[PDB]
Design a protein around this ligand. Structure first.
Ligand SMILES: Nc1ncnc2c1ncn2[C@@H]1O[C@H](COP(=O)(O)OP(=O)(O)OP(=O)(O)O)[C@@H](O)[C@H]1O
Ligand SMILES: [Mg+2]
Ligand SMILES: [Zn+2]
Lengths: 272, 187, 286, 94, 131, 53, 51
């Protein structure tokens, strides 16, 4: 029947594969496929993603080598992944997530292939500093889709794909990440602090330099804090400078000194 | 060198050659010897004392304390052999020689000539013992169109940057020395 | 030898996916796959890995499938997509090695002269470092003990390329604890450090129990390195060290004095202004 | 013999252990440092020596049991401190 | 959650950043800035930046994509600097003192000679044989 | 197969540009007709001996 | 939409994409082209002229 607000769950492995391949491809656009299950009409699951060789034709249907795709699928079936392929992702470095004119036609072919295949656009150079610019698109054939729920407008579109047709020729589908408790705190081991890192005593000369600088900054802040309190007269009732800056300085200084003293003490008494 | 994704620094390269400067160094000056040039024994002796001896034999200069002359300019009637003399000096000294017609250094791009001459002197400092030769210097050394004066200022500044240790020397050749700005003529 | 191996998020997520994939239907003590990486200096950086058809007998510990042609052409295609990554090492998920594993490593040595094996215990979600790394060694042991085809530990750690770093951070965001964590996270980190130190010391206890009781062979090595560790303890309460410790602690105390006093002053300044403002409102209301 | 708890060697005990006069203990310790097998330091005005070790050596099973005991005392102290800090800082720790 | 938010605020201003030149502000949370790419932009200022640092010719680091101004950096024409000292001088001590009072004190302490109110020195004359 | 894979990957345009000095750690520097400098970790499909500044 | 406020040369900001004129901003004076020779409103006052 006619589709709806829908959803697309992509796995952690899939997302990292996509981001890594995109950051490998920049500045040349690169593309590949995701494996997944059409679990139902209201959401599509993709798990695992495999990139495919970058031909000189650029991101297009011709860039999809049938031999490479077929034998990759066969070997993944042997290795334990019988997941049948819906979805193709491509990279748009330097510009937002939207389907270009080429992308419209590639997704038209992909839709003709299965029916509900989903396009994915990743910008590997804008997806940085903790923000990931990922988005997923489907083409329309009056009424664009059925809005039978409120989980279609929990997100907001963007002007870039708006002119490029985020509702005009294609529509964006809300993206969700199906992480589980096992992948959780498996990834976390990457920033996980080690016990020796916990008992590490920093550096005493560097700590003294830090206290030296921060107390001097405290003095220079208090100098104008005095002026601020001496202009308490309430001419033209007006968060810059003295008060909250002094607050953050005292907070960081006090916590650093307390933690250094505590680590030093614990090391003194426990280590012999 | 910078990545084109996060712009971080990797593989910091030594320095650029500015391939023009590559051409003005690895250009054949001929097999001319001091024998092939005749009639200028006084001038040949002076030039070899000013440009060859400070280069090949510096210890005399540093111990004695003499600041070696930075460069010497050649003037005279056309066809007297100034360019030939420079060619002989280039050919006989086993060194790194730089020769470029002044007219060619001027470029139609904004401030390209100043960067050109800056990179030439940087290459000369990089590739000591280096020798740079100027022919028809009056193309840019003339009396005070705008870019000519702007690049002449860069010439004065850069060759004022010659530190005493450097084994680099200057030869300018011209046919009308009067047109030269007195700025260079100063000690 | 090889001094360090750094392991990226992508390989560990891939092996977790492989373990869930196989254990979903064909639950088995381990799964075996191949890593891809590059060499800097004498450190190794591993970011790629694929599952290979593998099978182990239950107890014969000599019977095993690892697919030659599958490994070869899968590597060829992974080179086609990205040619930098060449075959280094092989991974498995079994929390324990097997007598059968050294044959696996010898086969892998056909594709890499110094192939390194990595145990990734996916099921454990514990104190730390879910990756263990091992190289193959064959040497006379220099002490009269019989030589043997042996696995040797090489230190390992997790490091991420920037794209994998943003990818992992975005998924961790909801459960992510803040990096700064002024007091709470630091005190919890110190307590966790004491926990880890106690756990490691108890492991060393159990090893010494097994060695003294004889059920475990004396390595001679490490145990004398452990004796060096035991002689390395600093022995605090030596007098000049006590003087220096008191001096530095007093410096920390005067600094924290200044911070606390300023905090009290600013607290009073907020209090007085709040009283003035509410009293002004009350006086205006009448 | 000791886990540094008495590692400030007095001259007399090293002399009688080496059955040599007090005047040769300096040469003994200097030879030991020069070979690179001890990194102690010598005092002569008190005749005591500041001893630090860097060279490990063989262990007998007797030494194994002794080590297990002296390490047991240490890990007992670590566990003591762990539960002490966990108790006193419960509200902040959580 | 506030720790998370300020961590993200610190993150948005991290490398890489494109330098540009600060133009005069419009409002407390925005200003005009001309990127070193040449183009100018109307750009929100990060609220964490101390406004007093925004002198109308300051160099400010901006977000590479959004051009958002996120940082303020902390700030001769030729061989004019001659690299010669009074030690190199051939002992013109009287001339040394004369010029030193004539110019060196004015170039060093002209504000005192301003509190005198005299329009501190403007011209001195050098005269003698050519070299 | 390798040659055809290279052939599909040598399609116009080629963005003509000038060469600059080479480095060893054999590798090239390019000044674009768009007036920008790039460094290549590898020179490419042509050999280092033929090319020159 | 208050176009009648839009006099020529008001230094008015656009949007980064689709332009879609955004808002007026303050004007552009900084008359350094004239200030190279213009003296603006000068300082001299009849009081320090004597005689
Ligand atoms: N003294 C000389 N001995 C031998 N050949 C000479 C002598 N003077 C000039 N010539 C010859 O005359 C020609 C002059 O060429 P050259 O460019 O060197 O002249 P120039 O006087 O230095 O001119 P310019 O400064 O314009 O280049 C050359 O072919 C050179 O061989
Ligand atoms: Mg000439
Ligand atoms: Zn596209």
């Amino acid at each position: 029947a006619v589709d709806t607000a829908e959803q697309v769950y992509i796995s952690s492995l899939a997302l990292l594969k996509m981001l890594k391949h995109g950051r490998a491809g920049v500045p040349m656009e690169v593309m590949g496929l995701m494996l997944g299950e059409f679990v139902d009409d209201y959401t599509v699951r993709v798990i695992d993603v495999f990139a495919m060789p970058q031909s000189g034709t650029g991101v297009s249907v011709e860039a999809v080598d049938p031999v490479f795709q077929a034998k990759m699928l066969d070997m993944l079936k042997q290795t334990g992944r019988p997941e049948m392929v819906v979805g193709w992702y491509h990279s748009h470095p330097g510009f937002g997530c939207w389907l270009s004119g080429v992308d419209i036609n590639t997704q038209q072919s992909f839709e003709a292939l299965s029916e509900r295949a989903v396009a994915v656009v990743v910008d590997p150079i804008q997806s940085v500093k903790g923000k990931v610019v990922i988005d997923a698109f489907r083409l329309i054939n009056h009424e664009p889709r059925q809005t039978t729920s409120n989980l279609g407008h929990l997100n907001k579109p963007s002007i870039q794909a708006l002119i490029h047709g985020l509702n005009r020729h294609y529509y964006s589908i809300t993206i969700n990440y199906r992480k589980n408790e096992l992948e959780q705190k498996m990834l976390l081991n990457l920033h996980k602090k080690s016990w020796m890192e916990g008992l590490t005593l920093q550096d005493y000369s560097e700590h003294c330099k830090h206290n030296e600088s921060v107390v001097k900054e405290m003095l220079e802040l208090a100098k104008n804090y005095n002026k601020a309190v001496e202009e308490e007269d309430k001419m033209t009732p007006e968060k810059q400078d003295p008060k909250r800056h002094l607050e953050e300085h005292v907070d960081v200084l006090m916590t650093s000194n307390i933690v250094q003293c505590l680590a030093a003490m614990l090391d003194t008494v426990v280590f012999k | 060198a910078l990545d084109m994704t996060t712009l971080t620094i990797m593989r910091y390269l030594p320095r650029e050659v500015d391939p023009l400067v590559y051409n003005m160094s690895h250009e054949d000056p001929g097999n001319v010897s001091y024998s092939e040039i005749g009639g200028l024994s006084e001038q040949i002796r002076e030039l070899r004392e000013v440009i060859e001896l400070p280069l090949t034999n510096p210890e005399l200069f540093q111990r004695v304390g003499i600041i070696p002359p930075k460069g010497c300019l050649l003037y005279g009637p056309p066809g007297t052999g100034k360019t030939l003399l420079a060619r002989a000096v280039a050919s006989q000294l086993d060194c790194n020689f730089l020769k470029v017609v002044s007219s060619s250094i001027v470029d139609k791009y904004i401030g390209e000539s100043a960067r050109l001459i800056r990179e030439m002197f940087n290459y000369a400092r990089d590739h000591q013992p280096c020798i740079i030769f100027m022919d028809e210097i009056d193309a840019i050394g003339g009396r005070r169109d705008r870019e000519i004066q702007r690049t002449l200022m860069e010439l004065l500044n850069q060759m004022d940057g010659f530190d005493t240790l450097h084994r680099v020397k200057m030869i300018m050749a011209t046919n009308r020395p009067d047109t030269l700005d007195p700025a260079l003529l100063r000690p | 030898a090889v001094q360090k191996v750094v392991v990226h998020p992508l390989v560990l997520l891939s092996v977790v996916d492989h373990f869930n994939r196989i254990g979903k239907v064909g639950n088995q003590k381990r799964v075996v796959g191949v890593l891809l990486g590059s060499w800097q200096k004498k450190v190794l950086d591993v970011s790629n890995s694929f599952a290979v058809p593998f099978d182990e007998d239950d107890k014969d510990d000599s019977v095993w499938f690892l697919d030659h042609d599958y490994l070869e052409n899968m590597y060829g295609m992974f080179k086609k997509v990205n040619a930098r990554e060449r075959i280094v090492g092989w991974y498995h998920t079994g929390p324990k090695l097997h007598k059968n594993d050294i044959a696996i490593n010898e086969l892998m040595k056909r594709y890499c002269p110094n192939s390194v094996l990595v145990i990734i215990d996916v099921k454990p979600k514990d104190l730390g470092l879910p990756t263990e790394a091992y190289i193959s060694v064959e040497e006379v042991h220099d002490d009269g003990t019989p030589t043997s085809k042996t696995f040797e530990h090489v230190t390992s750690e997790i490091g991420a390329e920037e794209a994998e770093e943003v990818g992992v951070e975005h998924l961790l965001r909801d459960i992510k604890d803040t990096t700064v964590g002024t007091l709470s996270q630091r005190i919890t980190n110190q307590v966790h450090g004491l926990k880890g130190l106690n756990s490691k010391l108890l492991d060393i206890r159990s090893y010494l129990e097994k060695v003294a009781t004889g059920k475990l062979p004396i390595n001679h090595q490490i145990i004398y390195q452990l004796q060096d560790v035991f002689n390395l303890l600093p022995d605090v309460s030596l007098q000049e060290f006590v003087k220096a410790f008191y001096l530095k602690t007093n410096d920390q105390m005067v600094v924290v004095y200044l911070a606390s006093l300023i905090r009290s002053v600013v607290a009073l300044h907020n209090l007085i202004n709040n009283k003035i403002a509410n009293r002004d409102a009350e006086k205006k209301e009448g | 013999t000791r886990p540094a708890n008495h590692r400030q060697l007095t001259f007399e005990e090293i002399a009688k252990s080496a059955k040599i006069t007090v005047n040769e203990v300096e040469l003994l310790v200097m030879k030991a440092l020069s070979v690179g097998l001890v990194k102690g330091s010598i005092d002569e005005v008190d005749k005591r020596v500041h001893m630090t070790w860097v060279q490990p050596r063989v262990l007998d099973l007797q030494q194994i049991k002794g080590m297990k005991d002296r390490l047991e005392f240490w890990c007992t102290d670590v566990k003591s401190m762990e539960m002490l800090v966990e108790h006193q800082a419960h509200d902040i720790l959580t | 959650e506030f720790l998370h938010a300020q961590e993200e605020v610190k993150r948005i201003q991290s490398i890489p950043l494109v330098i540009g030149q600060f133009l005069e502000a419009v409002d407390q949370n925005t200003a005009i800035v001309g990127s070193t790419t040449g183009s100018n932009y109307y750009v929100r200022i990060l609220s964490t930046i101390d406004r007093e640092l925004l002198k109308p010719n300051a160099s400010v680091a901006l977000h590479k994509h959004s051009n958002a101004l996120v940082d303020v950096l902390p700030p001769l024409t030729s061989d004019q600097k001659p690299d010669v000292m009074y030690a190199d001088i051939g002992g013109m001590d009287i001339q040394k003192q004369e010029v030193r009072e004539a110019v060196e004190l004015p170039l060093t302490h002209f504000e005192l000679y301003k509190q005198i109110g005299i329009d501190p020195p403007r011209g001195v004359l050098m005269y003698g044989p050519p070299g | 197969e390798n040659s055809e894979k290279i052939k599909v990957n040598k399609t116009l345009p080629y963005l003509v540009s000038n060469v600059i000095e080479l480095l060893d750690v054999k590798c090239a520097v390019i000044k674009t007709s768009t007036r920008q400098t790039y460094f290549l970790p590898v020179i490419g499909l042509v050999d280092a001996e033929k090319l020159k500044p | 939409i208050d176009i009648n406020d839009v006099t020529p040369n008001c230094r008015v900001a656009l949007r980064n994409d689709s332009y879609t004129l955004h808002k007026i901003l303050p004007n552009k004076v900084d008359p350094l082209v004239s200030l190279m020779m213009v003296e603006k409103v000068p300082d001299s006052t009849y009081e320090m002229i004597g005689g």
